[PDB]
Design a protein around this ligand. Structure first.
Ligand code: CDL
Ligand code: 3PE
Ligand code: 3PE
Ligand code: PLC
Ligand code: PLC
Lengths: 174, 124, 243, 90, 55, 83, 654
């Protein structure tokens, strides 16, 4: 539930009405006219919005706000192009970087994480264990072998026996 | 217009100026063009089918004629494989027998079964 | 981007979903028309790329050539080709809109004309764009470890099972896809920085943020194409009619 | 927990109920992966035979090499639509 | 003989931090999950996997 | 040569003649990361290495040849050399 | 300490860190970073070679699964065989000398952070070309060394000819990459596997009609990169890259990878006598072609590039005669020849104010440059197989094995490979005379400022001189030897002819190469110095011949005009006569004109006669007469109304 001010929001338009257009206010290739603008351009940045203030108001405030922001935007970016204005530090955060680094990128990493650990349940990893269980069901005496010996005593059954039971689903064939 | 494909595009152009296509490489380099890299003045009319006559086009040798060059290449290809084939008739014979192996030709060592002894095994 | 990454792979999906499981007996009579048409799109449309003055049209015909490789993996009636065409569809949809960001995305925003003949010497004032020229081109050709080669490889292999002479002729696509892409890459990358061209900005933060996503998402598939075998292993079987 | 669902043939399951049809599809499929793991196990054994044998692999496991080249045409994925859409002996 | 030094440059630039942080975080996450072979018997994120039974 | 260069373009591999003033400081970070990477990868891939010959016994291979002969015998498969 | 992940991962560090931290570390730190990691890679692989001489069992490692579907698995398996460790101590030693050599040779080059990144990268994808344990990782390294062979010799992107030479090189390699993909698709269907251990276990069962189809593809793949005659014009068109790049790409590595494909596949090579014959008679052709071009071209880099492709013909002859120990030993000692030859040539190019490369413009440099003299004469006497050096052990016995083989027709390739050795002497004397012994040829400033380079150019030439002298006698009992079970290649004993070619050689056929190589090497120097009119005739007939062999046995002209240019022309007969010409006639251009005409006619059906009542009223009569006659015509025969209806559509729409 952030805040705004109404009378400041009217006085800002009263301030802007006497100002030159954005296509003129910076095309003079200092501080007589360029010093009022370097504060007004920071009125774009100063972040008076309101979280719950957008919900609980009428459109009379909304149109007034929207026209004021649409002029402060030009006074910021035109002065950024020709010339706070007269500084240089990096990097001035943009408009898209909040919901591409903090919603797009972590969901897009979470997608990689889920794809890696969903690959654990695979048909090869299940078919190997099912084939070993099918060996140990018919011939459970190789369970009595030691733990190191069983991995070579299953393979002699696999190589030896068929153990596939595909021709038993095809009883119409023979 | 020199090549047979440049001639075959005369009825398409209607307002195109139809200039003479000349390679960008065979221009001299010592004239100071706008583009020293590609040998081309700033507003110079490009040819019908330019990108065979670009600097980035093929190398386009200029010493031999291409027809002659074809004859010389196939001439070397012929004089190698003809001489090396005729020289197989003038070969001398060997002084040794091929060597021999035990165990009925090592049929069992390189695979094999008693019925299958023909495919595997050498020089009993 | 949404055309070449999404609208094209839809009919790759629709030849699986609509055609193959109720047209099962009408295809095996008639796959060797699909091999004719897919081969002479690979042979013909990847050969008309060589003579192109425009810069977006080249990446268009590149999309045609890879989608012509992909539908001779679907129509193989074999098990590797289906998965190979799916990994083509998921990797071409990454590598190709990145190329459209390179051609009409970045370079048309800077200079507004898409003729090739103005554009050389991009390295001397944009080094960290010429890198994105090269690694993304060499991803389009089908260098391994990029996810395009896994798809090209398995689809040429699946189309080699079904008819080996058409697969042997169609294997030349690795060459034919290298020719025009590397010819474009070394025209753009090399040479003296051009006369016509004032020096403009480096590639900016958003046009790197897009690119590195579309490059990592190829490289992960290229290092492990198995990260999506957990989905597809039924649909590798759901479309085979070799009795 | 390694679950083992039942085997359903396509023969006499009345292709108007989607329960037994889909189980017949999945069962023929999963048994086909099992049929493949025998190929993938003999290949793993044949390579160990080769690497330990060294020069006499020609005669130590001629049987495993010929075994692997016998399984190779007939242990692969083949499709449930071949046996579902067609009946033999009709 | 002087190699004509260029202005000073920090090591940990933002891409170093971002790329190395995400790569080492994913490696630590993989080892964290592979550490549950005897502690639980299955991986940690498999506990978040709740599909319906096939029946 | 030492021709002049524009200092505004920022490459990743350095530019024309990259010799920043704190390269002795950053060399320590680079060698620390390189030795950490080399040691961590060399210890991480220790149990994945095996020795080629002698990893399985001869008796295993002889009985796998026996099981091959059993499976081959039951299907009635001639030798490849048998015609 | 794994001694595999330190062989693999350590040049991976040497590539990745110059790019990521390039601007941060700078070129002075990357000179000594990139070098010393390859140095310690190199001294780990000598130690592993020393251990591998103890017992013959390699270590492999197994990594994460690349892809498995039916009947097919692909893993990341890296295995350092004897065949692997030979090439491994070749490429690590040559590379680690070049990383040091290019510190002083490039000390005025701007962009040498990228250049040392690129040198150590080319080292790395060679490092994984060699040691992979399936045919897939052998494809991985095979392509990324082609990618580097783009990025390396086009180092000066400003230069035009370097960019077009990178085009030439990579598209030549890509021609063989297509056939390697064809062959690999045949591999994974005949055998089902890309691993070596299954394919070599079962290769003796598949018949010849299939292995011809495999090794034709896997020989066109090697014929492209190991630079046989079918396409060879990318080696000599790779000299727009600098000299330490040529000291890798032609000394051992990139030439060597095509030989390595045929050295791995030696267990499937035996059961095809059909491909070994054509291997013989392509490798026999290229010794002659490169020896005849290397006489007449007078450029310093082109001499040694055509020397490399005159000796890969000798390796290919050694392959086709089923003698793989000879080819592997020549591959080993050949790197230590050539890298020293290239980085001696780079030292005498770098030691001139103009930095010129024509041998016609060097003159007498013997008293001025004695160090590079004694190095390049180590190189040349090694290269001509003089008795004491490694060249006698590594080159003459391949000439010997042509006489000793069991096939009668291989007595021809004795003289075919012999001529090439006499021709090998006659250009090495050209390069030793015309840049060191002759009268001077430049202006005299280059004789005032002729000097030698600091320590980074001296010391690798010193070490490679020592190796190119001793390593052939030291390693002659592991590859040659007599009963040496070191490499695991399985020769068919009906094709094994090494015991025959050691003893059945008479005194004449063994004496004759050594002797006439020496004697012609004196004759070229004497005929240069005393008479010199024999070589400077102005015969109209001999000089057409000289201009043939100067211009690469015209074939660059042949390949360019008859294939490339015709390929571009017939690709313009598709993009304009088919893609834009005739498929728009059946598309949106011909149908626009069709609908324009047909619409214009149905519009003009009732144009004039402003008495619209009479115009529409004489139209209602016809359309109850024409229908009324039409039906009469129909119910006698149906076929005779179809042309009536087509003609009504013709008179209506046109
Ligand atoms: C586990 C491994 C996997 C992790 C992947 C890394 C994730 C890190 C990404 C990140 O942190 O944010 C950066 C990334 C973009 O960078 P950025 O900072 O935002 O760019 C803004 C400015 O450019 C930034 O400012 P800039 O413009 O000044 O930067 C200039 C630009 C320079 O301009 C250029 O020219 C760029 C050059 C081309 C860049 C191409 C990228 C290729 C990277 C190859 C790296 C090789 C790594 C392996 C080598 C290991 C080294 C030992 O520099 C670069 O961007 C290049 C970065 C390279 C620096 C690398 C330094 C640290 C290396 C650490 C590597 C460690 C790996 C593991 C090793 C340790 C573990 C054993 O933004 C993202 O958020 C990306 C999304 C993150 C997830 C990525 C994709 C994951 C999932 C894919 C989809 C799922 C699969 C597909 C499913 C489809 C349906 C089936
Ligand atoms: C029987 C045994 C078979 C073994 C091989 C036999 C010999 C085959 C020799 C031909 C194959 C060589 C590989 C083909 C690619 C050629 C690429 C190439 O050469 O590009 C070079 C060219 C610039 O090079 P350049 O100007 O000469 O450099 C001079 C530097 N000072 O760069 C360019 O700008 C060229 C761009 C066009 C590239 C060529 C386009 C045509 C390619 C022809 C392929 C044919 C495909 C036909 C498919 C039909 C299938 C039914
Ligand atoms: C597979 C492994 C992962 C994929 C590769 C990962 C690489 C990640 C980082 C790449 C950084 C490359 C780079 O920054 O090169 C910049 C280089 C600048 O050149 P420079 O000397 O600074 O001078 C320019 C004149 N203004 O710009 C250039 O001049 C162009 C040369 C680009 C060299 C890039 C090297 C990597 C290429 C690998 C190909 C991978 C294909 C897939
Ligand atoms: C950079 C140069 C190469 C560096 C090599 C470093 C090796 C470190 C140790 C690895 C251990 C290992 O990988 O284990 C392998 C594990 C599990 O397989 P396993 O069955 O348990 O073991 C295998 C041994 N077998 C066969 C004998 C049983 O699978 C994986 O991890 C796969 C994770 C892939 C994530 C998706 C790819 C992301 C890449 C994105 C890059 C931009
Ligand atoms: C077949 C050779 C026929 C023409 C040779 C030629 O005349 O080529 C010239 C070279 C001589 O050296 P050059 O400086 O290149 O002469 C250039 C002056 N021309 C243009 C007048 C020729 O001859 C040789 O070295 C080969 C002779 C020894 C061959 C022994 C085998």
């Amino acid at each position: 539930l952030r805040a705004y001010n109404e009378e400041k929001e009217l006085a800002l338009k009263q301030r802007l009405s006497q100002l030159p257009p954005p296509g003129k206010a910076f095309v003079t290739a200092k501080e007589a006219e360029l010093a009022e603008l370097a504060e007004i351009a920071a009125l774009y940045k100063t972040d008076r919005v309101g979280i719950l203030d957008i919900l609980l108001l009428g459109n009379k405030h909304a149109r007034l706000y929207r026209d004021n922001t649409a002029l402060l935007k030009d006074y910021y970016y035109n002065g950024r192009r020709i010339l706070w204005e007269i500084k240089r530090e990096g990097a001035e955060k943009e408009d898209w970087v909040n919901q591409m680094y903090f919603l797009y990128a972590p969901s897009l990493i979470l997608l990689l994480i889920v794809m890696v650990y969903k690959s654990r349940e695979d048909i090869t990893f299940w078919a190997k264990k099912e084939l070993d269980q099918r060996v140990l069901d018919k011939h459970p005496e190789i369970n009595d072998a030691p733990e190191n010996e069983r991995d070579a005593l299953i393979v002699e059954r696999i190589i030896a026996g068929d153990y596939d039971k595909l021709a038993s689903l095809q009883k119409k064939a023979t | 217009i020199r090549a047979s494909f440049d001639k075959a595009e005369e009825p398409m152009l209607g307002d195109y100026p139809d200039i003479d296509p000349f390679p960008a490489q065979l221009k001299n380099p010592y004239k100071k063009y706008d583009d020293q890299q590609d040998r081309r003045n700033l507003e110079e009319p490009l040819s019908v089918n330019d990108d065979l006559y670009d600097m980035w086009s093929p190398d386009r040798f200029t010493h031999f004629k291409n027809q002659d060059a074809l004859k010389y290449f196939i001439g070397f290809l012929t004089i190698f494989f003809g001489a090396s084939y005729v020289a197989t008739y003038f070969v001398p014979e060997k002084a040794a027998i091929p060597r021999e192996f035990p165990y009925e030709g090592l049929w069992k060592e390189s695979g094999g079964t008693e019925k299958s002894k023909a495919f595997f095994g050498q020089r009993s | 981007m949404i055309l070449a990454g999404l609208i094209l792979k839809l009919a790759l999906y629709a030849i699986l979903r609509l055609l193959l499981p109720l047209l099962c007996e009408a295809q095996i009579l008639y796959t060797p028309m699909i091999y004719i048409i897919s081969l002479l799109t690979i042979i013909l449309t990847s050969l008309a790329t060589l003579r192109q003055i425009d810069l977006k049209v080249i990446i268009a015909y590149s999309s045609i050539s890879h989608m012509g490789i992909a539908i001779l993996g679907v129509c193989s009636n074999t098990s590797l080709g289906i998965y190979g065409s799916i990994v083509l569809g998921v990797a071409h949809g990454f590598v190709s809109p990145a190329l459209f960001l390179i051609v009409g995305g970045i370079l048309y925003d800077r200079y507004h004309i898409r003729i090739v003949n103005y554009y050389k010497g991009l390295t001397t004032y944009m080094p960290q764009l010429a890198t994105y020229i090269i690694i993304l081109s060499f991803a389009n050709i089908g260098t391994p470890l990029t996810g395009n080669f896994t798809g090209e490889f398995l689809s040429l292999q699946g189309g080699f099972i079904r008819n080996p002479i058409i697969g042997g002729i169609s294997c030349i696509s690795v060459l034919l896809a290298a020719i025009y892409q590397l010819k474009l890459t070394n025209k753009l990358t090399g040479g003296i920085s051009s006369i016509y061209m004032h020096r403009t900005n480096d590639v900016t933060i958003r046009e790197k943020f897009i690119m590195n996503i579309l490059i990592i998402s190829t490289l992960i598939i290229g290092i492990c194409p198995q990260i999506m075998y957990n989905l597809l292993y039924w649909t590798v079987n759901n479309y085979i009619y070799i009795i | 927990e390694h679950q083992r669902p039942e085997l359903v043939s396509f023969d006499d399951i009345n292709y108007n109920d989607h329960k037994k049809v889909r189980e017949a599809q999945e069962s023929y499929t999963r048994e086909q992966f099992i049929r493949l793991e025998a190929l993938k196990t003999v290949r793993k054994a044949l390579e160990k035979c080769y690497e330990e044998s060294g020069p006499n692999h020609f005669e130590d496991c001629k049987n495993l090499a010929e075994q692997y080249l016998d399984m190779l045409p007939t242990h692969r994925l083949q499709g449930y639509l071949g046996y579902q859409r067609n009946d033999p002996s009709k | 003989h002087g190699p004509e030094l260029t202005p000073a440059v920090p090591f940990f630039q933002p891409y170093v931090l971002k790329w190395a942080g995400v790569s080492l975080g994913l490696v630590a996450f993989y080892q964290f999950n592979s550490s549950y072979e005897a502690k639980n018997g299955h991986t940690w994120v498999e506990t978040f996997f709740h599909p319906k039974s096939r029946e | 040569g030492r021709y002049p260069f524009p200092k505004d373009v920022i490459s990743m591999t350095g530019g024309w003649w990259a010799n920043p003033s704190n390269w002795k400081l950053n060399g320590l970070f680079a060698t620390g990361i390189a030795v950490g990477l080399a040691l961590w990868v060399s210890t991480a891939t220790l149990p994945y290495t095996r020795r080629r010959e002698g990893i399985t016994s001869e008796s295993d291979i002889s009985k796998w040849n026996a099981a091959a002969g059993v499976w081959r015998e039951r299907h009635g498969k001639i030798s490849t050399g048998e015609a | 300490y794994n001694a595999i992940s330190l062989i693999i991962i350590l040049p991976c560090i040497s590539w990745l860190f110059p790019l990521f931290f390039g601007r941060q570390l700078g070129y002075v730190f990357v000179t000594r970073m990139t070098s010393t990691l390859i140095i310690i890679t190199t001294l780990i692989t000598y130690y592993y070679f020393y251990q591998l001489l103890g017992n013959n069992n390699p270590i492999n490692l197994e990594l994460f699964n690349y892809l498995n579907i039916d009947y097919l698995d692909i893993n990341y398996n890296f295995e350092i065989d004897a065949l692997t460790i030979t090439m491994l101590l070749a490429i690590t030693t040559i590379s680690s000398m070049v990383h040091i050599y290019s510190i002083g040779y490039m000390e005025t080059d701007p962009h040498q952070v990228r250049f040392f990144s690129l040198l150590s990268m080319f080292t790395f994808w060679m490092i994984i070309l060699v040691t992979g344990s399936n045919y897939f990782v052998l494809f991985v390294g095979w392509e990324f060394i082609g990618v580097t062979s783009y990025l390396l010799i086009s180092f000066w992107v400003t230069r035009l000819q370097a960019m077009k030479s990178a085009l030439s090189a990579v598209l030549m390699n890509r021609f063989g990459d297509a056939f390697f993909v064809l062959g690999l698709c045949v591999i994974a269907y005949v055998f089902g596997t890309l691993n070596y251990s299954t394919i070599f276990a079962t290769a003796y069962l598949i018949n010849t009609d299939l292995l011809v189809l495999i090794m034709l593809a896997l020989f066109i793949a090697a014929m492209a990169k190991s630079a046989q005659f079918g396409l060879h014009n990318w080696l000599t068109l790779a000299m727009e890259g600098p000299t330490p790049v040529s000291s890798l790409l032609h000394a051992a590595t990139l030439v060597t990878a095509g030989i390595y494909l045929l050295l791995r596949s030696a267990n499937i090579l035996e059961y095809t006598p059909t491909v070994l014959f054509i291997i013989l008679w392509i490798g026999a052709l290229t010794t002659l072609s490169a020896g005849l071009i290397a006489i007449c071209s007078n450029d310093l880099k082109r001499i040694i590039a055509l020397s490399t492709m005159s000796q890969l013909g000798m390796m290919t002859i050694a392959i086709g005669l089923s003698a793989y120990n000879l080819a592997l030993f020549h591959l080993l000692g050949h790197a230590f020849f050539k890298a020293l030859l290239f980085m001696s040539a780079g030292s005498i190019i770098h030691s001139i104010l103009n930095e010129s490369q024509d041998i016609r413009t060097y003159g007498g440099l013997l008293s001025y440059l004695p160090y590079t003299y004694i190095c390049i004469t180590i190189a040349s006497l090694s290269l001509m197989a003089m008795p004491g050096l490694t060249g006698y052990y590594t080159k003459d016995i391949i000439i010997e094995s042509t006489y000793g083989s069991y096939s009668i027709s291989n007595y021809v390739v004795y003289w075919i490979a012999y001529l090439s050795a006499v021709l090998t002497c006659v250009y090495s004397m050209k390069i030793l005379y015309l840049t060191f012994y002759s009268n001077p040829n430049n202006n005299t400033i280059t004789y005032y400022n002729a000097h030698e380079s600091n320590i980074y150019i001296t010391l690798p030439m010193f070490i490679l001189a020592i190796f190119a002298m001793f390593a052939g006698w030291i390693l002659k009992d592991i590859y040659l030897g007599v009963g040496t079970d070191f490499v695991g290649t399985h020769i068919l004993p009906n094709n094994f002819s090494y015991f025959d070619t050691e003893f059945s050689i008479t005194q004449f056929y063994k004496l004759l190469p050594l002797i006439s190589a020496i004697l012609v090497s004196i004759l070229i120097v004497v005929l240069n110095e005393f008479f010199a009119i024999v070589f400077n005739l102005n015969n109209k007939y001999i000089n057409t011949v000289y201009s043939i062999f100067n211009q690469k046995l015209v074939s660059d002209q042949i390949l360019n005009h008859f294939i490339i240019f015709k390929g571009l022309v017939t690709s313009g007969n598709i993009a304009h006569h088919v893609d834009k010409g005739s498929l728009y006639r059946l598309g949106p251009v011909g149908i626009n004109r069709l609908l324009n005409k047909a619409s214009y006619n149905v519009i003009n059906l009732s144009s004039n006669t402003r008495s619209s009542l009479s115009m529409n009223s004489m139209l209602i009569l016809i359309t109850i007469v024409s229908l009324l006659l039409l039906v009469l015509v129909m119910n006698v025969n149906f076929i005779i109304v179809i042309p009536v209806l087509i003609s009504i559509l013709y008179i209506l729409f046109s």
